[PDB]
Ligand binder design. Sequence first.
Ligand SMILES: [Cl-]
Ligand SMILES: [Cl-]
Ligand SMILES: [K+]
Ligand SMILES: [K+]
Ligand SMILES: [K+]
Ligand SMILES: [K+]
Lengths: 501, 505, 500, 502
Amino acid sequence: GHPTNTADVRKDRVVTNSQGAPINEPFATQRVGQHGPLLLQDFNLLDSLAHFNRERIPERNPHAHGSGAFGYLEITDDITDVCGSAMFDTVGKRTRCLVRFSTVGGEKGSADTARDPRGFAIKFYSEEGNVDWVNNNTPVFFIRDPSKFPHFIHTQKRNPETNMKDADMFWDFLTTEENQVAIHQVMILFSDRGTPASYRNMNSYSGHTYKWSNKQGEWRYVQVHLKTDQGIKNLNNEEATKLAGENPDYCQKDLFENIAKGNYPSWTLYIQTMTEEEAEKLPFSVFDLTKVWPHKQFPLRRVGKMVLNENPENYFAQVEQAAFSPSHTVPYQEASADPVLQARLFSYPDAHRYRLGPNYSQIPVNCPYASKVFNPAIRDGPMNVNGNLGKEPNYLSTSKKYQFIQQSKPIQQHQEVWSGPAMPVHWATSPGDIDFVQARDLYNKVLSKQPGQQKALAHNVAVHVASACPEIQDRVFAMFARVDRGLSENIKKEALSLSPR
Amino acid sequence: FQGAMGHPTNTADVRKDRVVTNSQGAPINEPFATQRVGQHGPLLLQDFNLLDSLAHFNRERIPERNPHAHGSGAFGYLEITDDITDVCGSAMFDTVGKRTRCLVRFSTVGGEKGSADTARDPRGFAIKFYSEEGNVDWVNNNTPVFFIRDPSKFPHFIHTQKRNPETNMKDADMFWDFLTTEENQVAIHQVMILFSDRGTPASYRNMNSYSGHTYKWSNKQGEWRYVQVHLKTDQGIKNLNNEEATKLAGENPDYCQKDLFENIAKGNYPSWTLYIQTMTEEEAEKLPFSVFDLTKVWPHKQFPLRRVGKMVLNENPENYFAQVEQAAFSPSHTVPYQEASADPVLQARLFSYPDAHRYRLGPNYSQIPVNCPYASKVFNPAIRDGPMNVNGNLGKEPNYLSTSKKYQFIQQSKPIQQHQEVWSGPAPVHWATSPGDIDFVQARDLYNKVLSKQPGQQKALAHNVAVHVASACPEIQDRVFAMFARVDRGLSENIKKEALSLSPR
Amino acid sequence: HPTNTADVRKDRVVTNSQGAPINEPFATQRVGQHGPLLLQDFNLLDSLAHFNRERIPERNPHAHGSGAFGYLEITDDITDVCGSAMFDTVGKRTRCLVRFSTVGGEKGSADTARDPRGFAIKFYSEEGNVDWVNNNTPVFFIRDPSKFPHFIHTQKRNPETNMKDADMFWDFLTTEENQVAIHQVMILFSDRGTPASYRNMNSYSGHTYKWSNKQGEWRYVQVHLKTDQGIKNLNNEEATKLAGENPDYCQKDLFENIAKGNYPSWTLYIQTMTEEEAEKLPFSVFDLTKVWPHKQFPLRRVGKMVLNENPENYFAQVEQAAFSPSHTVPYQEASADPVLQARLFSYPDAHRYRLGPNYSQIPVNCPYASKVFNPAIRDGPMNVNGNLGKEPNYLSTSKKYQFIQQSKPIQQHQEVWSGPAMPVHWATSPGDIDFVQARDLYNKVLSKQPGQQKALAHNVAVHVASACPEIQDRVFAMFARVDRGLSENIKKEALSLSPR
Amino acid sequence: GHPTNTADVRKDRVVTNSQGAPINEPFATQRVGQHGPLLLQDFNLLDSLAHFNRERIPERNPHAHGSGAFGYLEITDDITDVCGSAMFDTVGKRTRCLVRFSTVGGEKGSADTARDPRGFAIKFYSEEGNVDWVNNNTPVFFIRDPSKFPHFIHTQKRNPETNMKDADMFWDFLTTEENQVAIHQVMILFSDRGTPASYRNMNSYSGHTYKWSNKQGEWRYVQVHLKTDQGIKNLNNEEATKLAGENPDYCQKDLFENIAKGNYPSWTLYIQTMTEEEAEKLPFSVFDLTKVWPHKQFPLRRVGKMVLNENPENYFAQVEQAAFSPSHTVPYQEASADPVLQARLFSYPDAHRYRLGPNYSQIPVNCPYASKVFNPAIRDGPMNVNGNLGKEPNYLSTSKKYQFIQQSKPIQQHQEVWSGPAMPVHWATSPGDIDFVQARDLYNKVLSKQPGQQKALAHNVAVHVASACPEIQDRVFAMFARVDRGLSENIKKEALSLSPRK
Ligand SMILES: [Cl-]
Ligand SMILES: [Cl-]
Ligand SMILES: [K+]
Ligand SMILES: [K+]
Ligand SMILES: [K+]
Ligand SMILES: [K+]
C-alpha cells in the first residue's frame, strides 16, 4: 500500500499491550481471589480503558460529517500559458489526490441526506508541495463578509438554550437586510441540488476567484469547475427525509461500494480565466463570493480528469485526521483579495492545530510525501514523531548549506497595486438589484429548463419556513418576492396551509 | 433593588448596558467591518477582532463523550419521603422532607453527537446530587442489567455497537459476532431488554432508572447492606415501536430533547419514585447467582422494593453546552456511607470516568459551575495549579499539611469498607459465560413471565431482532438464531422465519 | 480584589475534589494490612492524577519571571494626545498587574542571567484591558518578524547538545543581514544586561504606537517608564555568583520590599511626533532598532505607577497571566512597525495554546471593569462563567445590542498606504545608518559612566571566548564598525582566555 | 542510524514550509508596499510563528531536568534460575537501552549540580516488549505511603505564595512525626552523594523490591544494583554551588563530551534475591522502600554490564519525549506490594498521556521496535501516525487469527496469598528505633570509613536549615539526635552560628 494509506500489522498475530508486551489472556483482570475487588496493578486493563477514553478528538466546525477517497488528477490539456505549477506542466502527468466530501451543519452522527451544501475538498500531493482546493458543490456562498461566518454557522446549527435546529434564527439572519446577499446561495440550497443523490453525482467549484500565473510572469483571475462524469442527480425533500431515518450513511455506502467494485467516479476539470482589464469592466466584483462569472462571456476550458479509485484503509487515520486549508498552495497559484477567502487562509491552519495538534503535518495522510518538509526553524512540539531533523541546526547556520529556489518567481508583487488607508469595511447588501439578479437568472433561465424544479424550490422552502413564527415567515416571503413574485406566492400558500394563523 | 439570582449551578452574567465587546472587554464599534487596505484590498493582520472571533470559533468544540455522546438534561430535586437511616447514614437521607438538588443527563449509548434521539439503545439516566457531604453521582442506565460482567470487554463491546473501522458504518456482523461469541453470551439478558419495545422509549419522561450494580450502604452504627436502586417513572412506561422510531429518526432526530424541554417549560414537571432493594451478607451467600454480577436482577418477591423518596425535574438548563455538555458524572463520586461493591464492572468504572473527564474537559473540570459541589466546597491543600485554574487556587494556603495551620478531618471513626467483606486469595479472572442455564434463566423468565403478560410484546421482540440481524451474513444469523433458542425455541423460530423472509437464501 | 483573592472553607474541613470529606489524610486502601493496592481508592487516584497535571507549558520566551499588582495615577493632562478613559482625568487611578521576566532562560533558570528583562503591564480599564508588553530597553535585536524564531533559538539551547552555544549565538548576530541587531547587543552587554533588581530598571514601549484624541488627531508615541529607585546594575561576576547562591534573587527582592511597604514606583513619560516630523527623519519610526533622540523629541510627563500588592498565589496570578500588544483600548493603536504587527497575532495564539481557549475567563485575565459581552463567542473547553446563558449566539433582531463610539475612527483617519503585496526582507542597510546609534551609546552615554566602556568589552570577551576563532573574528570585526578601541579591548581579553 | 535515534533530511537542502512548498526568500514578509502593514495572507510567516508558539510541552513533574544517552546491556552471567525474561536468556546477549538522568526538584532550567537525588531510568527494548527500570541513584526514598508524594514533592519545590524554595516547609514536612521515616534518605541526600560529580560516577538502584519468576514457576523477591565502573565521585557543597552559577549544564556536558570522544561509561549489574521464608523472618518489611537489604545476609550476584555509547541526535525528540514507567514490564518481572511502587504503576502512564499525548507510544524513542504493538481494541486518538492497524477489526473477530502466547505462565497468582478486608492504612513512622537504625548504620559503619564525611554531612544540613525559623531548626536538631547526638551537636553548632538567636 501507499505510505499515505497503509498500516503495519504483526504477521505472527501475537496480541500485545501498548508497550509490546504479550497479553496471555484477552480478558482476564486481576482481583483478590476469584471475586474480590480489583487490584490497581492491572496495567493491561488500565492501558486499554485509558486509551478508549482518548479515542475521540474534537469534530470539525463546520463540516464534521463526511466521507473520503483517494485518486489522481490526470492532465489532458496544456494550460501552461495560464499556470506554471508543476502539477500542470506536462500533458499526461498524474498527481495523487485525496478528497473529503461532507455536509456542513450536521454533527458527526447526522444524516448524509440532510439539506446542506456539500464540501468537496481536494488535497493534491505534488512535487512543489501539497496544494488543497477546499471547495463546496456550489459556485457561491452565503456571505461576503468573513466576520459574519461564525454568526451564520451558529444560526445553521442548534439553539444554545434548547439544543435544537431553529427556523427562527435560521431565517432571522438570512432576512436581515445587510445579510440578504445570501439569497443566491439560498436559492441553490433549497433547490433539489441541496439533497444530492450521492457524492458521485455532484460538482465542485472553487467558488472564490484565485490568481494563477505562468512562468513568464503573466497572470489571470481563475475560477475552477469540476463537473461530474456521472451526471447530476438529486433527491427530493421526502426521499431525503426518509433515507435520513432509514439509512443515515447512504452516501458513505454509495461511495465506498462503488469504488470497491470498480465503478470509479470521475470528474472533468475546467477553468474560467479573466484579465485584469476585463475584471474592472464587470458590473460586479471578482472578489464577491456570492457572484458567478457568466459562461457565455467566460467559457470553460478543459484541463484534465480526476478519478477516485481507492478506498481508505482506516477511516479515522485517513479521513477524520485529514487536514485541508486554502492556504496550502503551490508556486504560481495564489488567493485573490476575496475577503472571505482571505479569512480562510488564517482560519484553517489554526483549526487544525487545535483539532489535530501542532505537528498534524506529520500524520501520513497529511504528509507532503512528494516534497519532504525541510525547515530548520520548525522544530519540537508535542508528538514530534519524524526525528525533528536530528542534529540539524535550528537556524540558518553559516556552516551549512540551504537552497532557496525560485528566487525570481514573484508571489503577488506583479499583480494588483493597492491604495488607501487601513479601512474597516462592512460589505453589506448593495442597494438596487445587483445582489438579486443572479438569483433571478437562476430561477428564470436555469430551473425553468428543468421540469418541476421551480415548484420543488418553493415546496422546499415552504416546509422549512413553516416552523418559523409569523413575522419571520412574512420577512421570508418579502425577500423571495424580490426574486420572483410567483415564487414568493407559491411559498406563502404552501407555508400558510401548514401553519394557519 | 437587586433582582433574583438564578442558581449558581445554572446561571449567567450578561452586561445590563448590552455593550458588545471583544474577548478583552474593549468595545466593538461596528459588528462586521474588517480592516483591509482601501475598500477591497487584501486583509490586514492587525484586525484583532476578526482573528479573536475566528480563533474562538475554531475552539468551540470539545471531544464527545465515549460512549453516551448524545443526550439531554434538566435540573430538579430529590425529596425524602421515608426514613431509611437504618440502612444509610448519608446526609442526603438524614431528614424526611429534605430536598437535595440534582442534575440529570439522559442519553443514548452508541450514537454520535448528531444521531437520532429515537435510536434503539439503552438510555443513560445519570443523576448528580449536590449534597452537604459532597456531590454523589448515580450513573445509571434505564435497565437493571448490562451486556458484560468483565470490564476488559467494554472497549471491545462498545466498538462493535459503533462504526466499522474501515467503512465507517454500523455493522450487524460485528454487533452479533461479539454478542454470540460463547464467552460473551452472558449478554443475553440485556439483549432481550434492548430488543424489546423498551429499547425505544417514547420519551425520557417514560422510562425508569436503575443502579444496575449492587452498592454497599452503611448506617451510623456500622451496619451495612447490599443495595440496588430503582427509580420508577410516575408518568408510566410508554414505548415506540421499531417503525415509529425509524420514521421519527428522519423527521425529528431531537424528538426526546424537545419533549423534555417543552414539558418542563410549560410546568408539566416529570417525576419518579425512588426505591431500594436491600440484602444482608448472609442472604447473598445463599443466592444461586452473584450480587457482583451485573447481568442479574434480584427477584421482587424475595427482595421487595422499599420506598425512599420522589425525584422531580423542574428546571431546564440555561445553556446546553455550559451545563449539559460539560457535565461530569462518575460512580466514584460518592458521599460518606455509600460505597461501591466488588462488582468488577463497577470497580473499573471508578477509574474510567474521572480519567475521561480529565481528558474531555480538563484537569480542573470540578471548577466548572455545574460540576462544583456548591453545598460542600473543596478544600484540599495538595490539589493545586493545573490549566484553567479559575477559583483562586486557595491563595496563599500552604500546599501541604503545615504544622502552623489547622486542618479538620471529620468522621475519623467511620469505616470505609474495612467493616464489610473479608477477602482472601492471591492476586486474573475471565468471568466467561457459565455452564448450564444460570446465565440464561432470567432472560427466559423475562420472556415467559413478564412479556407474555403484555399483549404483542413477545411478537415485537422477535420482530425487532429479525429486522436487525437480517443485515448479517448467514453464518452469523445462524449463531443468533441458536443463542435465542437457548432462551425459547419459539422466540427463535419467530426470529428466524422473519429474518429469512427479509434475507432469503 | 477579584483579580487577586481566593475562597477557603472557614471550618478547615479537608475534602476531595468533589467536596466529600476525607477522614484520614494519608491512609490508602489495600487488602489486609500490607497487600496490594485497590483500584477503588478514589482519594489516592484523585490526588495523584491532579499532581500529574499541575504543570502547563512555559512561555516561549520569557518563561521565568515574577509579578506584582498596583496602579497608575494620572498626574498630567495628555488628552490632547490620547482620549483613552484611563487618561481622561487628572488624579485618576487604574489597577494594574506587572510581570517581570528574563527572555532566554527556562523556568527555574537564574534571575541574574544576562538578558533583556520583560516589563509587561496589564491595565484594567473601563474600556477594556490594555497591555503594554514592554522590555527594559527601547530597542530590540530584529526588525524582520520572520527572524524571531531563528533569533530566539540561537539564544537558547543547541538542539543536539542541549547547551547554550556561543557559536550559534554569534553566528546569527554577525550574519551581515542581521547586524542591525548591533544596538541591542551593545545594550545587552553593558551592565544594564544584569540589573540589580526589577525595581532598578526602566520599561520602554520599544515600538512606536499611534494615540488619537477625541477630536480625531493622532501622533506617533513612544512610552518611557523611568524607575524612581534609580538604575542599579550588577557586574558579570556578581551576577554569576548570585546565579549559584540565589537563583531567585530578584523575586526575593520584589516580594520582600512590597511586603515591608517599600513600594517601588516609576514615572511615566511619552515622546510624541507627527507624521510630518517622521517623514523628515533619517531613519524610520517603524524601525524597532532605533530610538528617538531626547533633544529633538523631549519627554512629557503623564503620571506615576506604583506596585503595592504581591500576588496571593504565584501560579494563579503570575504564571497564568496573559499579555498581548493586541489587547488595547480605544484611542491606542499599533503602528506599522513590522515586528509589532506580527506580535499582534503571535500572543493571542500562544495564549490559546498555553492556557486554553477561554483563558480570558481566568480571574487575573478577566476585564473586571469592562465585562465581556459578545454573542458570537461561546462554548470552548472550561467555559466557567455560564456562557451567557440563553442569549442568542448571533445578532437577533429581537434583542438589543449597543455598539458605542461608532463615529470614532480606528486607523482610517491616519496613513494612506500604496503599493502591491510585496515580500520585503528589511536586511541591514549599507553604510552606517544601522550603526550610528550604537556608536552614540558608546561615545556619548557610556563614556560618562566610569568604567562602563571597559565593562562592555569585558562582558563580550568572556562570552565570545567560547566561540570558534572564525566566529570570534566576525565578532571583533562587527564591534570595530562601532569603535576601534572597543574592538581591540574585546580582542585582547578574548584571545587571552582562548589562545590559538 | 537506529530507528529510535535518527532523522530524515532532504538531500537537496531545499527549504520548505510545513506543507512542502518551497520558500523563495528566507525572511521576506508580505506587506502593502515597502513599509505598509502586514498582510494576513502571508502563510509562511504565520506557519513559522504559530509553530514556534507550540514548541513547548509541560515539563515532567518531578524530574523535569535531565540528560540521556543510548547503549546496550550485555548478559555476562546465567540467572535463568531466577528470571525467565528473554533479555536474560543467553549469555552474551545484548539488548539496546535508553537512559535518562535527572535531578528531582528543580525545573527545566535548574542546575545540574543541585543537591538532590538523581534519577537513573533505563528503558530496555526487548523482544518481549519494552521494560523500564525507573530507578534513582539511592536504594531508598523519603516515603513509604504513596499519598504523601504530592505533599513531599510540594515541600521540595517552590512556596505557593512567594515562588521560592522554602526551608521551613522543607523541614516542617520531614520532621512531622508520622513522616520521620524519611530520615534514612535524608541522611543520604545531605551526604556528599547528594551532589555527584557526574552521571558517570553514580549508581542506580531499584529501591523497591520486585518479584522475578523462572520458567519453572519459582520466584524470588529481587533488588537490582547498577554499580558504576568509573567509581563514585562527589562534589562538596561549595563546589556544587559555584558550578551552578558557572555552568548549570556541567553534567550534561560531561556525559555528552565523554561519549563523543569514545570514553563510554559503564555499569555492572548485580541483584539480591530473597525467598518468601527469609522475608517472614526479617525485622523489617521487604515492602518498605526506606529499608535496604544488608549485603552480608544478601550478597550481590553479578548479571551483566551496561554501556552507554551513543548520544541522542535531537534532545527534544529522544530525551524530552522519552516516557518511562515501572508498569512497562516484560514476562517474568512483576512488582511487589510495596505501596509506593503500587501507586507508581498508575501514575506514570497517566502522566505520559497528559504530558506527551494518548499515542505517545508511537513516538520513535518510545516505540517497541523489537516487539511491534498489535492490539485490535487500542485505536484512534489524536496524532495516530502509524496507520492505526488499517482495516483490522477493532475487537476479536471470529473471522481472524489472534495468538495469545504464554497462556500457562502465571502473572502473580503463584506468589503471595493476601487476606483481610479492604483496609485504609497510614504507614506512619513506627515507634521505637526500627526506622532510625539503618540511618545510624550509615553514619557509624559507612560514612566513618570516608575521611571527613561525617562532618561534611553535618555541614551540608547546617547550611540548609539555617534559613529555617528557630522552632523548625530545633525539631531538626532533635530528629538527627535520634540518629547520633554528636551529629546533632555538630549541625546545631554550625546552624546557630549562621543564624544567632536572642
Ligand atoms: Cl489527560
Ligand atoms: Cl491551539
Ligand atoms: K463564485
Ligand atoms: K442488576
Ligand atoms: K524604538
Ligand atoms: K530499598
